[PDB]
Amino acid sequence: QVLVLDGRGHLLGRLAAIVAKQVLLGRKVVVVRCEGINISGNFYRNKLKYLAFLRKRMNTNPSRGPYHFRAPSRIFWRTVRGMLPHKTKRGQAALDRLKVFDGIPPPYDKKKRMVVPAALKVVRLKPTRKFAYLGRLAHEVGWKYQAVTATLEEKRKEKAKIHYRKKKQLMRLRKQAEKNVEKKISKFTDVLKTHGLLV
Amino acid sequence: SHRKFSAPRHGSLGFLPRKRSSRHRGKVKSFPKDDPSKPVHLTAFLGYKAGMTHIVREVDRPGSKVNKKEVVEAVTIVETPPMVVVGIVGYVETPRGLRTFKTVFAEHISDECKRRFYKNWHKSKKKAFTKYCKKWQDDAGKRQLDKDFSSMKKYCQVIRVLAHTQMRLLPLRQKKAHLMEIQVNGGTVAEKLDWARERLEQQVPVSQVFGQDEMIDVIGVTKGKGYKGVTSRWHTKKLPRKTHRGLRKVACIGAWHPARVAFSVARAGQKGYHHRTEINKKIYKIGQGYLIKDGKLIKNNASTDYDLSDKSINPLGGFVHYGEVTNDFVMLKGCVVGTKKRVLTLRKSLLVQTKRRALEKIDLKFIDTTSKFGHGRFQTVEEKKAFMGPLKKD
Amino acid sequence: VRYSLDPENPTKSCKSRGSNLRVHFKNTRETAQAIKGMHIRKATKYLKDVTLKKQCVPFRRYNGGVGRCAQAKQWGWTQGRWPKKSAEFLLHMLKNAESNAELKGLDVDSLVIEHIQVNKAPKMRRRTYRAHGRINPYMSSPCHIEMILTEKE
RNA sequence: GCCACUUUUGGUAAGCAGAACUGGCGCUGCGGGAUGAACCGAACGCCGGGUUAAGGCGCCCGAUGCCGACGCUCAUCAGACC
RNA sequence: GGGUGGAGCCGCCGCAGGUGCAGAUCUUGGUGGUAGUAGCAAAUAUUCAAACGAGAACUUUGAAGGCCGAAGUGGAGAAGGG
RNA sequence: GUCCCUACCUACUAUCCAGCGAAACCACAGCCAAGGGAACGGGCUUGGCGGAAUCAGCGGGGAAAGAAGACCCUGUUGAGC
RNA sequence: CCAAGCGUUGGAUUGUUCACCCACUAAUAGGGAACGUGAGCUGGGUUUAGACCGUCGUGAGACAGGUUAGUUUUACCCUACU
RNA sequence: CGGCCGGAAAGGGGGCCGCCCUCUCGCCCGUCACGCACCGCACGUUCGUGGGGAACCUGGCGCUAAACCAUUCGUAGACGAC
Ligand SMILES: [Mg+2]
Ligand SMILES: [Mg+2]
Ligand SMILES: [Mg+2]
Ligand SMILES: [Mg+2]
Ligand SMILES: [Mg+2]
Ligand SMILES: [Mg+2]
Ligand SMILES: [Mg+2]
Ligand SMILES: [Mg+2]
Ligand SMILES: [Mg+2]
Ligand SMILES: [Mg+2]
Ligand SMILES: [Mg+2]
Ligand SMILES: [Mg+2]
Ligand SMILES: [Mg+2]
Ligand SMILES: [Mg+2]
Ligand SMILES: [Mg+2]
Ligand SMILES: [Mg+2]
Ligand SMILES: [Mg+2]
Ligand SMILES: [Mg+2]
Ligand SMILES: [Mg+2]
Ligand SMILES: [Mg+2]
Ligand SMILES: [Mg+2]
Ligand SMILES: [Mg+2]
Ligand SMILES: [Mg+2]
Ligand SMILES: [Mg+2]
Ligand SMILES: [Mg+2]
Ligand SMILES: [Mg+2]
Ligand SMILES: [Mg+2]
Ligand SMILES: [Mg+2]
Ligand SMILES: [Mg+2]
Ligand SMILES: [Mg+2]
Ligand SMILES: [Mg+2]
Ligand SMILES: [Mg+2]
Ligand SMILES: [Mg+2]
Ligand SMILES: [Mg+2]
Ligand SMILES: [Mg+2]
């Protein structure tokens, strides 16, 4: 009942435009690894856009001015709350069901995370266009934790491969057991093949 | 319309919430960046501002007019008794920052350090760490509190030791010892922690933290000067004599149509007692404290090899509003932030320093120890009575 | 005379009232709200070191311009003041109610102030003399106090 | 009295001043043009069902979450609806 | 309907009017916020003990310290006050 | 010390308390940017965002308060000369 | 060209904005914020009533002509800022 | 029911080794009949020993504190605060 979205290779507003709607329809969304969100257009236009957003500080009290969040997860959080009606209390109760994370933290590392094909870079950009990584943009606009989160994600990848090797081993033991068992499950399999599940 | 005559603005906006400092002890906002090549060492220390005096030294800078001449230079005495290490704490780098991991305290910690955990030591019954210190005297706890060192040697990147001043040895009214995390910068994390768990519940002096002619940074809170006006705090121009509603003001706050008053406009509020970091203060001399050697104590911690007296660093009649410095001290170049008898933090420098003034060797040849409670005329009590002669009272 | 709040039992409750008392309403209201839940001995011990400036009255509603005090921190508030006309009038009123309890034959040491109430009285009039030949009103704001004590262990 | 299509006078011109025809606003809500006296649709008793106009259908926001069609377009100032 | 209230009131058909209030910088009366706020700051200054008293920074007596300084903060008038 | 260039000391304040305690003002009230608008919003729209109750100051803003503009024009309104 | 980060002064004359000149300088660039900024100040100028002079008017008086003297009121409210 | 490991970014109710017990039960076909068949009718079926709030119950092993005011300090100070 909790939707875990991946964040790698998803367009920024194209992902946010459906995260907003699933959140308004009552579905608790946790997007994860907001590092690898990429924005279309090239890096220099996107960095100029974010620096122009940094220029927008309130003249008399920049502490009361617009809080320019530098983390990638909170850039994505602010671009969802642009799309949500966050003044009204249904929009405020909406934003409480979006949970963004830089990298993949241990509540959600050992959980299978979902991919939107309808918001994805290889589907919604033609391949000669050049995109822009939100992680690199956030880093060199002033997010301090690129290298830390990169080493932690490398630590997670070298452990998820240890998990996946065992998963491969269990599937090979299964498909080597099935040929040993095909004499006594010959009639349990045949009623599955006649109903379209094992051929 | 514009300003007719351009002029730079008063004050700095970098220090902008000019409020009373929430802390009394100066806090290190950044320890020097660690590298696994150097041997392990503490990177901060605490001291107490005693007072000011002179120096005469011969300068060796080829190129100035003062090469092989002898300047005088103002210096600051910071009494630094050796600090007792009473714990360690580790830190793990997180994508949200740098979280504390596991604080481990020593077995026996002194009741000048135990004062810190109590807002009222008199009314209390002194019960802190009593159920905690019993873990060090049983095997049910010893295998508990060395397994966490084994986890601190796996998951921590930054190991910061936890020391405190030793206020039994100071001339002050206060007994509540200040305590401080000091980042240990050295080898791997195993070396870094198996260095400090032996320093646990024992001394660390100054001379194995700092050295002579090293530039350091002084952290501390300024001398508080109260709720003061805008010409006293922001140094704006005093309005002329003829003004009706007072002349020690800022005349125009702001323009019409930005319908607020900006955060950059000089206003009247708190002046002083601000936290400040002031870099590149040079150790001229690390003093050696009073110690008793063969019956009579040796006192000459202000004797140079060009003076050959038996005078201490203390002036006649002590440091004014401090007391007498009986401990080993650090003599900084120039003024530092803070009033008398104020706690200061000495931090090793964040910068790398290969400059002709930072690499200068300092060989003093006089230390003024005359009375600061007035125009002092005499260096020491012996020379004073040798010049005066027998008095009526003698 | 009908009070504003009836006691739940007149056999256990003893009552008192003071009409048209020349103290300030805004001070007396809040020094009554200070003692609206107290035992009678704790109430008199409170009202004496209100006069002796050792425990303060937290000015909570009528609190504009009232300076802060250190003693207000034990009421969970910042502002406080130590009024003494208001303290001594509803100290005499506790002596009245404590006389009425022994007139009714009640246990004095278990009385708790159940209900206390300060109303505005008919506002007496003086004048003051202001610049440019004008005269402005200079009223005094006295108060009606009523109080109900009730036995509870 | 004011505005608008087109015709038109003075003025460099004007959210300027002066005309003609017709429609509006003023006296007038409602849907659209984000916002709005005049623009586009449309004029009103209180309601239920259906359907449209002008305008829309990534999300705010009802509706393209069509396996919509054919091209053009890279902008270190893209472009985006009387 | 319920409560308070303690001496008069109303329906219909006609008649008559000083017949309906949110405004008039409206008239008269009362009451808020500001607000326990601004303030109670011109001319040097009070202190100790006792008494009466339910109660004393302020009264009175005693002591001490000050001031007006003979163009007075003194002693007496005229006008005015009654 | 008019200023360069401000600094320090004293008295009475302001400040805090015991007592006593008003008045001017007030449509509802108070956070900003831009848009349109009676052509310079606290309210509308789109954003930015928003945390009780409060204290000493301050003079930006409330196109702040006072006074049915005193300048200018209209009045078949007057007066002084 | 990228570029407003950091500077862009001290004075004689004048009420000056502009102007002109002396001297330093790295440079002595231009400007906007209700022609920024009077409950911030000053009141020199204009812009009240007193006065003198020139011109005009028979006259009261007039002068985008000159000169001289001429009260600059209030914050304790709310927001803002400290 | 006892031991071995797997966890740090916001830590794993997972795997494994023994034991004293226990079962031919569970799973897939068949045989046999029973269980309010509540008489056509709604929120049924769970995560649910849900989160919080009091008072009752019986036992076991453990706990006996600080904060704030008042006093003092003067590294601080309008008052608070420190
Ligand atoms: Mg300029
Ligand atoms: Mg003046
Ligand atoms: Mg001295
Ligand atoms: Mg209030
Ligand atoms: Mg106030
Ligand atoms: Mg008066
Ligand atoms: Mg008079
Ligand atoms: Mg026209
Ligand atoms: Mg016109
Ligand atoms: Mg009509
Ligand atoms: Mg219409
Ligand atoms: Mg539009
Ligand atoms: Mg048409
Ligand atoms: Mg319909
Ligand atoms: Mg739309
Ligand atoms: Mg009667
Ligand atoms: Mg009549
Ligand atoms: Mg009325
Ligand atoms: Mg009426
Ligand atoms: Mg006052
Ligand atoms: Mg006389
Ligand atoms: Mg006489
Ligand atoms: Mg005040
Ligand atoms: Mg008072
Ligand atoms: Mg509204
Ligand atoms: Mg203003
Ligand atoms: Mg005005
Ligand atoms: Mg008029
Ligand atoms: Mg006419
Ligand atoms: Mg006439
Ligand atoms: Mg102007
Ligand atoms: Mg003014
Ligand atoms: Mg102004
Ligand atoms: Mg003038
Ligand atoms: Mg004149």
Swiss-Prot record, chain B:
Region feature (Disordered): 1-36
Residues annotated with Tele-methylhistidine modification: H244
Post-translational modification: Constitutively monomethylated at His-244 by METTL18. Methylation at His-244 regulates translation elongation by slowing ribosome traversal on tyrosine codons: slower elongation provides enough time for proper folding of synthesized proteins and prevents cellular aggregation of tyrosine-rich proteins. It is not required for incorporation of RPL3 into ribosomes.
Gene3D superfamilies cross-referenced by the UniProt entry: 3.30.1430.10, Ribosomal protein L3, domain 3, Translation factors
Entry superkingdom: Eukaryota
GO MF, any single term: structural constituent of ribosome
Residue numbers of N6-acetyllysine PTMs: K135, K285, K293, K365, K372
Purpose: Component of the large ribosomal subunit. The ribosome is a large ribonucleoprotein complex responsible for the synthesis of proteins in the cell.
PANTHER family xrefs: 60S RIBOSOMAL PROTEIN L3-RELATED, LARGE RIBOSOMAL SUBUNIT PROTEIN UL3
Protein name as annotated: Large ribosomal subunit protein uL3
Species of provenance: Oryctolagus cuniculus (Rabbit)
UniProtKB/Swiss-Prot annotation, chain C:
Residues spanning the signal sequence: none
Record bears the keyword Ribosomal protein: yes
Molecular functions per Gene Ontology: structural constituent of ribosome
Subcellular location: Cytoplasm
Key words of the record: Cytoplasm, Ribonucleoprotein, Ribosomal protein
One GO biological process term: cytoplasmic translation
Cellular-component GO terms for this entry: cytosolic large ribosomal subunit
Function comment: Component of the large ribosomal subunit. The ribosome is a large ribonucleoprotein complex responsible for the synthesis of proteins in the cell.
Subunit structure and binding partners: Component of the large ribosomal subunit.
Family: Belongs to the universal ribosomal protein uL22 family.
Protein name as it appears in the record: Large ribosomal subunit protein uL22
Residues of the full protein shown: 2 to 154 of 184
